[PDB]
Structures are given as C-alpha cells and as structure tokens.
Design a protein around this ligand. Structure first.
Ligand code: HEM
Ligand code: HEM
Ligand SMILES: O=N[O-]
Ligand SMILES: O=N[O-]
Lengths: 181, 181
C-alpha cells in the first residue's frame, strides 16, 4: 500500500519533541504520533488530528538528479536515526495553476531544491508523500529522519529552503519534531 | 470535490453503446454508466464494476501548450456532444520508474501527444482523471465527448495515439462508448 497515516495523540511509535507552527494554522500539541500504513477511516479516540498521504511517481527530478540521489540517499529506519521531523506543507493556488515547466523552473532552476538537499545527504533520510489530491488541508507530508549529530545541519537546511523562491508559494507549514521510541 | 466515480450497471445518465476490450482484461458489459462526483465505497446492488479517479494538476503540459489548448478546447456538456468515450488506461511499471525528463520526452517529443490531440479540437471535449495513486487497477480514466459527426475523427485519433511510442508502455486499455440519455 502507498497510503500512510499520521495520528497525533497519546499513542504511537514516535514521541513528540515539539511542534513549531511555522506558517498558518498549526497542529495541536500531542504526546505521540502513530504512523500506520494505509488509510484510517476511524480516527482513534483520544487523538487530536490525522494526516494522511500517499507515495507517488517522480514529478520534477530528472534522470541525472535521480542517479545522484540514489547514489547517496540513506535507507529509512537506521539504528542511529532516532530523531525525525514531519513537515506538512501547503502551496498556494497560484502554484498549482502554473504549467509544468514554470513549476520546474522555480523548483530547481531558481530554488535548486535538489542540489541544496543533496548537500545534507547521507546524513538525513527522507520520504515524500502527496495528499492534495486526497482533499487534505495540506498538499504534502515530508518526513526526515537523522541522528542527533545532524540536528544542527537539518536546521541549517530548513533555513536555506525557507529563503528560496519555491517557498514564496508555501501557504501553510508545521514542524513536528519526533523521537524514536 | 475532485473525485469522480463511474458505476457500470443498470442505471445512470449514459447508455453503453459498446465496450471494446482493446488490451488486457476487459470491463463487463452493462446497460448504463452512472457518473457521480465523489467517492463511492458502497457499489450499488445492481452494478457490475466501479471506476474512480481524481482531477489533478498538470504533469507534462508546458505553458505555451496550455495556452494553445485553452484557446480552442471546448467545454463539457455541450448540447450537441451526445457521444462519449471512457477509456481507462494502465501504464507499465517501466513507465512509472522513469524520471520526469524521460517521461516528458516520450509523451511529447516522440509521441507529440498534445500536438496530435490539438488537431481534433474543438470537436472533442476531454477530461483527464488520475487513479494509480488511489490503488486502482487502472492508472487513468480518460473521458471524451463529441457530436456524432466527429465519431470518425475520434477513431482516427485512437489509431494515431496507439501507434505512438507512448502506447508501447500501455498494458491495459478498454473503450466504453456511451450515448447521453
Ligand atoms: C534533505 C534533503 C532533501 C532532498 C535530497 C530533497 C529532494 C527532493 C526532490 C528530488 C524532490 C522532487 C520529487 C519529485 O520529483 O517528485 C523534492 C520534493 C519536495 N521536497 Fe524535498 N528535498 C530535501 C529536503 C526537503 C525539505 C527540508 C523540505 C521541507 C522543509 C522539502 C520539501 C519538499 C516538497 C514540499 C516537495 C514537493 C515539491 C512539489 O511537488 O511541489 N524537501 N525534494
Ligand atoms: C483528443 C484530444 C487530446 C488532447 C488535446 C490531449 C491532451 C493531453 C494533455 C495536454 C495531456 C497532459 C496532461 C498533463 O500535463 O497532466 C494529456 C494526458 C493524457 N492523455 Fe491526452 N489528449 C487527447 C486525447 C487523448 C486520447 C484519445 C487518449 C487515450 C486514448 C489520451 C490519453 C491520455 C493519458 C493516459 C494521459 C496521461 C498520461 C500521463 O500522465 O502519463 N489522450 N492529454
Ligand atoms: O523531499 N522532501 O521530503
Ligand atoms: O487526454 N485525457 O482526457
């Protein structure tokens, strides 16, 4: 199954370290986050929110970039990757109205998204889920996990991405920092 | 709502004229197709199958191409457009593993999908729905409607599309011809 759900509440495999309401309406603070593979129609009792997304095909990356990423990208669930960050993101309607070449030019030519992110591998593992087409309040659920030694590097990366032209189209953003239980 | 459901059965707004099983497993013959805006977890009692897809953002079309289509494409629900064709399509795993630049090269550079399709406007209205990310047996639900006087032109377009490099990656196709009731 390509669907994944993220349940904010009192149970889960991940302990919430903090929630930073970066931009727009935030997410209610909770004790844990439970990650399930599949959809969850029955939102658990004693649970504050539910985020769901699906893995999908590549949308912007080209062959040379995929080869670069595939050459260094770390696997998920490394023994040492005990910190994780779940960053739901929403982009503006103006972004989704643009043609494919316009969005690619902003994504890479202007923001150099992949080139910048490649500088922080193999320290950080990542997973990208889509959820706009599901009608969710967010468009993407991004997931990053890494060892504590790279926490400062991840914060650096966040600052660099948040100054890019691409992020001028971001309308809602939240950071949920997690600790592997 | 961006989700659309197509129920094959004994009720609906469209009458099935014929079902041609072009490639792979087919669709059971039914009297009518019922189109519903929204998801449908409960397939009606007197129905054979259920297809669902969602409208999504542009994945390949360039700005200049979108401008060319927007200048000639007709709207849906024209009084004259009493014929419709619903063509579910599945593409091979080899297609989905390719990078964005590779898939775009096959779609337009080699197959000229959009240049070829533009030659049959404004006769043919169209709607593209995505369903692979929903876990459906098909990847796309394509919809076309037109006046009977264009039926020969549409068939010609089918033969042209099926001879393209893009269609070498198609591994399941069905044509459901419909008449507005
Ligand atoms: C850490 C290293 C990173 C790498 C290697 C990386 C790489 C990529 C690549 C190659 C894509 C394109 C996927 C596709 O073609 O479909 C992508 C998409 C995306 N990334 Fe990252 N990225 C990184 C960090 C981040 C961070 C820190 C964030 C958010 C804070 C982020 C948010 C996104 C979003 C929202 C998308 C979807 C873009 C869209 O479809 O509009 N990425 N990333
Ligand atoms: C009749 C005139 C047609 C026009 C103007 C046209 C135009 C287009 C355009 C511009 C796209 C790109 C959508 C995007 O960028 O997201 C597209 C996608 C697609 N079209 Fe057509 N098309 C036509 C006919 C057809 C026919 C007859 C079929 C099937 C028999 C078809 C099947 C598809 C499929 C499966 C896709 C999605 C491909 C993918 O995303 O991998 N089209 N069409
Ligand atoms: O690729 N950003 O999760
Ligand atoms: O061109 N898909 O309706």
């Amino acid at each position: 199954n390509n669907r994944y759900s993220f349940i904010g509440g009192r149970t889960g495999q991940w302990q919430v370290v903090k929630i930073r309401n970066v931009l727009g309406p935030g997410l209610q603070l909770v004790e844990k986050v439970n990650i399930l593979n599949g959809a969850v129609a029955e939102i658990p009792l004693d649970s504050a929110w539910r985020l769901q997304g699906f893995a999908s095909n590549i949308r912007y990356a080209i062959r040379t970039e995929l080869e670069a990423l595939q050459a260094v990208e770390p696997m998920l669930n490394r023994a040492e990757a005990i910190l994780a960050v779940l960053i739901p993101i929403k982009k503006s309607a103006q972004w989704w109205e643009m043609a494919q070449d316009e969005r690619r030019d902003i994504f890479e030519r202007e923001s150099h998204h992949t080139a910048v992110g490649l500088e922080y591998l193999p320290g950080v593992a990542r997973r990208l889920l889509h959820c706009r087409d599901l009608g969710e309040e967010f468009d993407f659920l991004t997931w990053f996990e890494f060892a504590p030694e790279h926490s400062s590097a991840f914060n650096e990366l966040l600052l660099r991405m948040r100054a890019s032209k691409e992020w001028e189209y971001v309308e809602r953003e939240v950071e949920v920092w997690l600790k592997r239980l």
